[PDB]
Symmetry: C4
């Protein structure tokens, strides 16, 4: 099948004419558009342009549509070329995406009034329950700032996306606490003056020993509780120092991408 | 020796004909297979394909079999080319790999019964010992989840592989604790009200000061115990913050590779 | 428009003559300067030089001035080429930048005297206020070392530049402490022996639980205070372990760039 | 000056003959050695070899000796080429490097005897001083293992090399402790029940608050001591989390390079 020669600043490219006919609207696929760059003396089309980029521009046609930016070609440059060669806004975006008492009442009432008002205006434009209700509505209040603080949105999108990541930290943390709250429970017990009788309390210690917080409300006195204490102080920093790189790589990405 | 010219979208490659005969089954090595792409006018074989990839495709023959994917060529693309040129499933994989009271009894009995049953069904398809036995079988129980929790397998494979890494953390931790539990022992002693008489107890402090847990069950009161305490708080975070990058790079790899 | 051919060690480049006339002072743009490298037999200018670099050297003219160093070309090499081709000191720098009781009184008086003297010599060359004044002038004294200690300058430039980064850590820390000092306040209260009555004190705990310092002056005794305590020990290490990579990447850069 | 053409698997290179004469012993510089690869029909030397590598092989001569391995060319491959082209062992290495009661007495005496014996055999093949002598010889004893433990050597070489790095951590730690042990000293004092009278003791707290160890032997009770306590818990983790990446990058390098 009749072949074409494209010269990009001395670098010669060759393809069949049907390969370019696969995208009739692009500059190279449109006879009338590329006609301006034909050299009758050499029988080739010449372009005084960026050499590194054309590799992909041609592969686009041969691949049926794949438009990847060569790793060694800047983003601003390669974008200009896609524009010049007239690849089309569709493929253009596809590339883009593939590439990237009273005072308390007054304050409480004023907010409920403003919030509801603003909410409605924008939208339109028993004894035991009282204990659980105050901890809910009053505690999650801070979440309102997320609507005016860019940072929170980033923190949220990262959590929603890296949920599987966090799920491991907690999971691994469990197996850890369970294994340590048990290994010390068997060596800490059967000894007087030891504040490690039950297991439920051994859970707190472990959670306080793995995160390295160490309040001092519970500490091993026996030899068997210290051996598992050292392994715990280590296993903790080891287990915790895992999902971090992931969440950070996600946050830093969501942060840099949003900004 | 008679040479051949291969034109890949304008980029010309040249090699001897025996070099290609070294792999008679591949497309380029098989006369009958490459015959379809010969251009009589130019005396060369033409391929309307990916330019960046062919560099390696040719080196494969010249190297006697080495099939490396150019750093600047996507994985999905280069794979297609290996397929087209018909390099062979062997070399193909080789590339792949080179590239990547009653309730307690009931619960206890039910499990032992189910586990043993499931185990057998799947397979077929004195006073001091009682103290060490309860800490063993009962503590390692959690390890059963590893068979239904992907995460654990990753954590295990990383440990089994980065064993030499962890061995250092503990090793370095030793030398550290030994050096600190001794430097403070000589400056903390010979002083009343000091809870640092013996060395074995100095070990606990050091292990609790390097991991930065600091329960508060032991703290320097002398000037010589604080100087070594500062160096300890530092040396600890320095020694611990070493094998981490390795274990993480292993975990993150085993995690991303498994997923 | 009359075209030119430039041969760089066998690699042929082609451009129009006006493209090179866009920078009349450079070697390639100056007829008298490039005349020395013209080959009459082939009708092309030949240069026995670095191939990888010329890609950019030519793009410079086609782009109207863009001078980027190819990712695969060393800095010392590409710099030499820019010099040879005589691109010009301007574009040269632009590239550079786009690329990178008595003793107390005596001591106090002597300093004030020396400092003021040195300052002037270099420049030319009520009861409640006394409490706030001593904490100010006397505390910020150390900042004087910054003028003789390179390290501080780096620490400062990184802070001044990554201010938005730090602003998040503190911000996120707030929302965290507010949410935790409240979630535990509702579960820690309504229970005797609990040292978590007020909220202002719950703030201290949270700040001491998220940074993982854990002095032991405050710890959850209830079940509801421990559940939020575990989430706090985690959320803390998660929130803190975020701006770090940024500040470090800034510090390490400012450090390596300054040195 | 008479020019030469080198064809590397279809990729044509051109240089002057003197450029190659600059290294008379290499294959390309030796008439008798390159004669075997000359093609009389095309007037060029042909090599059925790796294309990516030759770029550097030629630059070596043009540069007067610079032998850099292209970023996109494997180490094992490029090495083979340097060998084939016969560049010379010198340049070869240069490239390599540019590229990479009684029991106590018995035990004490036996060691002193063995050590001194082994030392000599290998080499040949008052009251206050007693307090400082026991802390020295007895404490640094562990350092003997470094001769049989690879890990320590790595830890040492990294310290000796990244000394300037560590010097900052300690330095920055100083300025920090000095600024915090002073900011809290002015707000913690003038208040009863406060364990922060003197400054020397404020130093311990700061060092225990920045490393996040928090023994609990000292904690702010005033409002002014807590505000500076939060800034301290942060500034600490910020200052410490700086030299880490450096020491790690050095250790990981010294570790991977040694192994
Ligand atoms: K800690
Ligand atoms: K701690
Ligand atoms: K603590
Ligand atoms: K504590
Ligand atoms: K305590
Ligand atoms: K940490």
């Amino acid at each position: 099948c009749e072949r074409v020669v494209i010269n990009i600043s001395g670098l010669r490219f060759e393809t069949q004419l049907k390969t370019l006919a696969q995208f009739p609207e692009t500059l190279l696929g449109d006879p009338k558009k590329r006609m301006r760059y034909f050299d009758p003396l050499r029988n080739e089309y010449f372009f005084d342009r960026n050499r590194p980029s054309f590799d992909a521009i041609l592969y686009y046609y041969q691949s049926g549509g794949r438009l990847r930016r060569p790793v060694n070609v800047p983003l601003d440059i390669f974008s200009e070329e896609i524009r010049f060669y007239e690849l089309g806004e569709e493929a253009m975006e596809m590339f883009r995406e593939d590439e990237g008492t009273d005072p308390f009442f007054i304050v409480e009432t004023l907010c409920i009034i403003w919030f509801s008002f603003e909410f409605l205006v924008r939208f339109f434009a028993m004894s035991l329950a009282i204990l659980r209700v105050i901890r809910l509505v009053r505690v999650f209040r801070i979440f309102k700032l997320s609507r005016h603080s860019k940072g929170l949105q980033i923190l949220g999108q990262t959590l929603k996306a890296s949920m599987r990541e966090l799920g491991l930290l907690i999971f691994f943390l469990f197996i850890g606490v369970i294994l340590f709250s048990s290994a010390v429970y068997f060596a800490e017990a059967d000894e007087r003056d030891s504040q490690f009788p039950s297991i439920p309390d051994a859970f707190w210690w472990a959670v306080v020993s793995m995160t390295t917080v160490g309040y001092g409300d519970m500490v091993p006195t026996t030899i068997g509780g210290k051996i598992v204490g050292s392994l715990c102080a280590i296993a903790g920093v080891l287990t915790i120092a895992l999902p971090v790189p992931v969440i950070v790589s996600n946050f830093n990405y969501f942060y840099h991408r949003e900004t």
